[PDB]
Amino acid sequence: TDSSQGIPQLVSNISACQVIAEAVRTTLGPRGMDKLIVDGRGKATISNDGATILKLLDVVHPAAKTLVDIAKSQDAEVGDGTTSVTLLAAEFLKQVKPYVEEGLHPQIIIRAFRTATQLAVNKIKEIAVTVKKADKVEQRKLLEKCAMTALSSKLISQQKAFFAKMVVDAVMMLDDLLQLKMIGIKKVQGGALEDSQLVAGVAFKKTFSYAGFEMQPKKYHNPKIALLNVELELKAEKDNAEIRVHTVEDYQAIVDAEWNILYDKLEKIHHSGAKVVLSKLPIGDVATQYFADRDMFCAGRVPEEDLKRTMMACGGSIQTSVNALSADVLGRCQVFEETQIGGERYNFFTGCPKAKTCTFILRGGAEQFMEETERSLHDAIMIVRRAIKNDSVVAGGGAIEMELSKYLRDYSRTIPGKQQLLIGAYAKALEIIPRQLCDNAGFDATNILNKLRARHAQGGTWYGVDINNEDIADNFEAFVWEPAMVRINALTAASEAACLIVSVDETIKNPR
Amino acid sequence: ADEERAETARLTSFIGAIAIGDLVKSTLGPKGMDKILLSSGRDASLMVTNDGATILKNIGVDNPAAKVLVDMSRVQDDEVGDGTTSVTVLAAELLREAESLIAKKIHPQTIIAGWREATKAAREALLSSAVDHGSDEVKFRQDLMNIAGTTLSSKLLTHHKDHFTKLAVEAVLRLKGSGNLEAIHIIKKLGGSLADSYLDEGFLLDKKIGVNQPKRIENAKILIANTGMDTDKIKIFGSRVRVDSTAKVAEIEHAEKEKMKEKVERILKHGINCFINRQLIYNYPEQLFGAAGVMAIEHADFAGVERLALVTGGEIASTFDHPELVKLGSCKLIEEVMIGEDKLIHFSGVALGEACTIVLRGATQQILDEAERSLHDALCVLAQTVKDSRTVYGGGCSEMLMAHAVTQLANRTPGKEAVAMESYAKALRMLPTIIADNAGYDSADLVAQLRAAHSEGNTTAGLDMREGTIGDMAILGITESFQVKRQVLLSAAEAAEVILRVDNIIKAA
Amino acid sequence: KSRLMGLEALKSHIMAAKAVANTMRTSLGPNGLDKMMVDKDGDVTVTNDGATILSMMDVDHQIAKLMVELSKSQDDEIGDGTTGVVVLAGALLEEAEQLLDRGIHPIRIADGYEQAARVAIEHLDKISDSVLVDIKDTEPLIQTAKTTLGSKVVNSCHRQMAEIAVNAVLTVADMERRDVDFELIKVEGKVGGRLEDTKLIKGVIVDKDFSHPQMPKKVEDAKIAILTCPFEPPKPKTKHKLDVTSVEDYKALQKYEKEKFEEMIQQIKETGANLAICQWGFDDEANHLLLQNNLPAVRWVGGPEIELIAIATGGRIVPRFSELTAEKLGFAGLVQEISFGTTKDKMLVIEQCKNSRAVTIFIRGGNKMIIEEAKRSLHDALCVIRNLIRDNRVVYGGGAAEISCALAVSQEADKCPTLEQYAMRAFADALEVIPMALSENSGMNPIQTMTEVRARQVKEMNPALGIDCLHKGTNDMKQQHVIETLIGKKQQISLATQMVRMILKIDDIRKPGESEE
Amino acid sequence: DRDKPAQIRFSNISAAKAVADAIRTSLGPKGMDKMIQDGKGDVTITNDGATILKQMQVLHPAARMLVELSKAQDIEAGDGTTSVVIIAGSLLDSCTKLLQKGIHPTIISESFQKALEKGIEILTDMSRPVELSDRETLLNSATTSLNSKVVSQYSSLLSPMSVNAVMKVIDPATATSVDLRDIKIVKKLGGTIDDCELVEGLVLTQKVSNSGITRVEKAKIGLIQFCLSAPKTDMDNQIVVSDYAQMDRVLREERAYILNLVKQIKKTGCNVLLIQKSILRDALSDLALHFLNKMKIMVIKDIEREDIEFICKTIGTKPVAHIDQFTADMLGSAELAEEVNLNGSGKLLKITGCASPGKTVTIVVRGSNKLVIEEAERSIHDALCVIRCLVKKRALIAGGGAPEIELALRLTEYSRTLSGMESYCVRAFADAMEVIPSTLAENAGLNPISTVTELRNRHAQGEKTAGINVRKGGISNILEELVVQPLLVSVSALTLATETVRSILKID
């Protein structure tokens, strides 16, 4: 039943909120130091962003928990915008602390936050630029160049331009969501970089070799696919038993009756409807012997992320048994084709009755380039999907961020009062974001930032410091391309995510 | 798991393993002084050792590099016999060198380098001090008697060695060019005197079923068997242990008797006058062997029933899996006879001619097992001495010889190799210090004179710890066989060289 | 909560890493020194091959945890540099650190290392020969498989292991792709012999079930019967005692076994071998009565084995007595019953030409640790050619290639300038650290012997002759016969230059206060 | 180090004089009692060497060597428990310095163990032969020692009974060691001193024979280590009745064991039966043992094993643990065996006369009450001990520590005669003898400092005459007031010092 009142708790709230932003300071452009974080569970914990470690960190603070949840409120929407919100609202809170000693504490606190955050979105949608199917691009040529935005921005190679169209394929196929939970991507070690692939359904990286695995079909044009969340192995149904002998005739039997059931278990789906049986869990010898006795496909230990998207793709269901199951709970494609790619026994699933899954298959022939592009795929995905969703496309990299705080430095003159201080703090927050990607561009922030300000006293269309080019210039014409929608989103967060707890300098906690 | 880099592990290597080479060199020589045995963690009861292998086996050591020596100690002690306390110290002698050499900037690579070649330089000088004695049987007789009891010198009980080594050389005198220590049946058995320790010509059993089985037999067939009787082996003669019905458990005993009784038959029907069982013999089949003229000896010695299988020409029954079918042990003589205070079952007419039973008779078992501990290490050297009949001049003689040899070679080498090789033959010169300082006499006198003596070169005058002073190695009995030396010269520098490559030690302990 | 800033994290990542890197650099070459392992139980073992000994080393610190994970992929394709990556991954480490302490961004020279890694790769790829063949490789494989054994286990050449290690590959090298994999042949440690005693087998082998030695040991056909079903009456790891309604019924029980032996021998006879490989070890009192019916059953051997020896033939295991089928039985080009060790029984040796999905080199040793490091020898001699199978390719040096690899990267630094000049400064020298750090663990000045080939690289280019791993007086990487796949060196670079960059991954070093516990 | 071992062996050297010093002012009855708190925290009042060291003690290796010292004296003698502990610290002074004086401790030991040889050589030379075949000269130096020492009262009665046992058990002229194994110390509860007896056969503690023969001639000595009850599960017999239809069926085979082994006793024939206790043996059927008694065998039911042991070896009743082992032959044959209620109150089976290995005599300690039975123990035993010393080393010698001081004088000069690095050793060695009578001339009072001064000179002068009278504790004659060391009481403690010391000096 504990509280700290006044400014002392208020200011105490910001650092707990700020320190996590000091991590993400630039985690979007990734460069910095990344420490592998092993929590008290023995779990090595890392991220491609700020949010996942934020997901991992917990606080007794409501404050430090809010912007967490807020950055998470921004996170799961776009899959991005976390670090942005993570920095900005904390930056506000970071900057008002000296003001807090002067005091902002009157509820002249909360006003200029959201009052000036509309000025941004007032500037956003007026400078916003919309993209279409015939417009400058197929909208695939956009999602190309927005992949060439998102994929290429981090390095890699002209496959980034090749993937730029290739990633858009399953995108266009599945485009509903902002993200890939229907799409997914298959990492392929082997082949080469220049060829990466896409399947109109799930395509299993590897299914797993058994006794009779070669003697079981790797190919079906009519897969009726038992989609198993559950294993069938020698351990699944025991072969161990015994029986009394004054005659040894029963040694064959007491094992054989159990043997029949391992058979019968897998066979009963096999007999009912099943050709293909995909288990995400082991298949052992004596079971797969009957699966090899069946020679209607056996799988085990296979990815469920593919197997449940196989349910998505096929129309069958993830099966918690091999029994009690119908022929409809079976997955279905017009293609079961296993042609091993590298070490991956590679199941083609396509021709599905629905094919809610269409998965891009990234093939590198090497490990490094892929996971860099696979990380850039999420980039492309989070963008190229959203580039369709909101066709109005703002530009990042201090495009408006320097252009907003430009006016939002210019907006200071008309304010004066207690919140003109906020206006300056609100302004340069926009510019504290590129204030890193400057360093990621190798640039000094401030001079570059001040240039950009001068460059926004000269230019100011898309101009900004782009770690994309490591230059300072128009972002949207630099192919810095993300929809203008996330801006309002972040800016609805930015000023407002800060104003929550600064509305509270008296924060009560209880044991109960 | 914590990485030990060079000096961390290496000092830890020295402090233990050199001190491990110390309390054992405290035992080095018969005048290597007695070390009261203070055991680590268990057995406060204290023997007092003139041989460091005890300490190594008694006292455990936490130093891993020292955990190596006890095994290398047991390498000698088991494989080579004597050379046990010695293999530990010479390594420490070479380790004391690498104390400097490491801190003296010499990388342990180089420290091995000379000792690679230097090991033979001493070997070869000790190949030079290797000269065949025992080239004659009388030589071989006294060449055994040379290094037989010489194995027993530092080893705590060198006194009954008078009777012991005579026994020890006779059995190996009986071997006559063919070493067989299984044809020597080793029975450590209490009763009588310690000078009553005995050598039978034949086989023997310390196990006596009793006199209720025929005691003496001539032209006796011995069944060598794991065959059980109350144990209910195969081939039902009548119900064994089982329940097949309400009363079937009752049909066991009487028909188990018949089973025991026809497990007389199968066993007896070999035509045996003796059934020697490494397993149980029930009293009815027992006494029905006693009524068959068969001597049925219960749970007879594992190694005995094994050596009775080796020496007497017997086959084990395959545990009655040859009910009638197993080749018998055949010994024309059965003697149930008292050596010591105990009637022991003597077997002669055995297959092997070298077949013998050495009966070590404890007046106390502390000396008895010590007699047996002093027995076989000799026999180890003896079989070696059999195969290579020869000596090398001990007591520092060939040591200093090798010392003056390898050092003057370390003087003609002296590249990176002598850095080890001068460090090498100094150990060959430093062990002569050990026994003489164990003898409690100045080595700097004797050694540096033994130096001069072997700087003149010498096969004869060497430091006699018996005299405590420099003295003849003519093959006086303190002249060692080439058997152990080559092994120690091989085994000793190893653990040094072994730790020399691994200074890096990763410890999760 | 602990909060590290920039270098702080790094500096915290520097502590054990270099210390771990330090233990690698004294392991370099025969000049180098093995890493002893005392376990958490205290078990004292001489070991090597960093990922191996880094798996034995308990990784608490983060950067060491990848050193197990990174060096894993290193040993697989290559077999060497697993101890050499952490050298450079430790060497290139404080390269960046001091630069970061010179004020140089992780944004700056970290790319330059990979940017110098490729050009060093690109440079390396010229050094010596990207070319071998199934014949040429043998001599590199000789000087590999002599020294691979002749480093780890012994220092001597053991040929029966040497070329049988490479030919085992060469046996399954041409089974797939012209490329074997590292499981596609197997190394089976058991000691019945000495080190040199070994079995090159084109399939897997086991010690046959022997329920009594005197019963005849036989082997027949080319084929084996691999059996989940009964070979004779099966036993399911469960005792079966003697219960018979009469004293005559016991002797009447005796026929049931023997008749079901030959019946299910006859049922195995027509199908495969006459021999079992049975997932059920049956009653050994009855088994030797079938061994008295002869045609030895292999039983009491793992359930995974019937799986193993089946698939090694490409065949199956017969699940049920009614399911008996020759394809559901395993195979071989020759099944032979050959003595394991000299004195012991005859293990069933299944040499499989009806398929080989693993050609198993079976190995014997005087002791484990030697047969272990003879195995652990073979694995690398197996791994190095797993590079050769893909591209038949090699190079001579860590003190020839790298000092030459560095030599391009060397002045390329001032050819860089701004960002990565300090990288290709800190890259090139970090390459020459390995001959330095090897000359370190050599008896020589790490500066002077590096100066040695330095002058030599100011003279010779792409040298076949470089400093001494084998610790000779002459330094000839061709005639030291230090032989490392230019794939491996390249892959090593790719793998060794990898980790240092990876600690920079995102901007988040942020921990709740637990980055290790 | 040898020094850490030295510091250890110094700690050995030290602690070996530490607790042994309680023995040194305890030398003789003029040596004083020491109240000794114990590990149980109990005062223990002891003047003697064997008791003090073995009663309260500690973990130090020297304490391990302490208890060995009087004990090795005991197995040799049982006489001189204190004196043997007095010679250690004596040499322990002779020892310690030679290290610090620059002499190697093996040289120190191979001195003292050899210095022993040359040293104790003249002891027997100083000594005098006495007749070990003659009962008196036996009884003389027996009782003369007992006159020199405490036990008199029932000794002068039972010291001739000692020798009466000794005279019987002495076959040879040197009388071997007169192993007290040939003698049997036994105790009857009822009876007086004079009831103490010597029987060639063995008296047995109690007896149980219910219907049986109380005295039996030419008596086969039976040994039942088997049972008279069929083997036990829940009962003594094999009868456990859960059914009558089965009980008739159980009736059949339970009839044997009670009959057979019982009859087997007299089938082989037995005049006697030794049977261990119904606790020592599973069950003894009395219903069987009654008929077994009534067969007129002499049954001692529930007889102690250690008498059986003395019955087995000494009077030759060979082990029967089993029917396979039960024959008429493994039975002893008792020339007479009798249950004896006589000699006071209470039953004792007395084998009277037997065919016996060695010369077997049972000397039964007896007295009007239990302590008077216990008074009869050292009354027979102490003489037996001083005899068995006098016989093992034939010659006697004038006692009292004069031969300590006597030959302490000499061996020095003979040490000095040796020269070598061990002359200073053997002389230090030789000196150590002087301190034993010093403490004796101390404990008996007044001046030890003077006593050994003149004596060792008197031992260059009068020797055997001038010595330490334990009563006087000064220059006197152990001849005038008779103090006799049967040589082994001295000859025992001689090497025992040097041996453990040689060990503990060789001990690192």
N-end to C-end Cα span of chain C: 12 Å
> Compute the gyration radius of chain D: what is it?
28 Å
Q: What is the count of helical runs of chain D?
A: 18
Give the CA-based shape of chain C.
elongated
* Biggest sheet record of chain D: 4 strands, antiparallel
Widest β-sheet, arrangement of strands of chain C: 3-11-4
Helix content of chain C: 40-55%
Class from secondary-structure proportions of chain D: alpha+beta
Query: β content of chain D, as a range?
Result: 5-15%
The Cα radius of gyration of chain C reads 28 Å
Number of strands of chain D: 16
Largest interface, with counts of residues having CB < 8 Å to the other chain, equals:
A-C, 71 and 79 residues
From the N-terminal CA to the C-terminal CA of chain D, the straight-line distance is 9 Å
- Assembly state: part of a larger assembly
Q: Main beta sheet of chain C, described?
A: 3 strands, mixed
In terms of structural class, how would the helical and strand content of chain C be classed? mainly alpha
Strand-and-helix sequence of chain C, N→C? HEEHHHHHHEEEEHEHEHEEEHHHHHH
Counted by DSSP, the helix tally of chain C is 16
Estimated helix fraction of chain D: 40-55%
Strand content of chain C: 5-15%
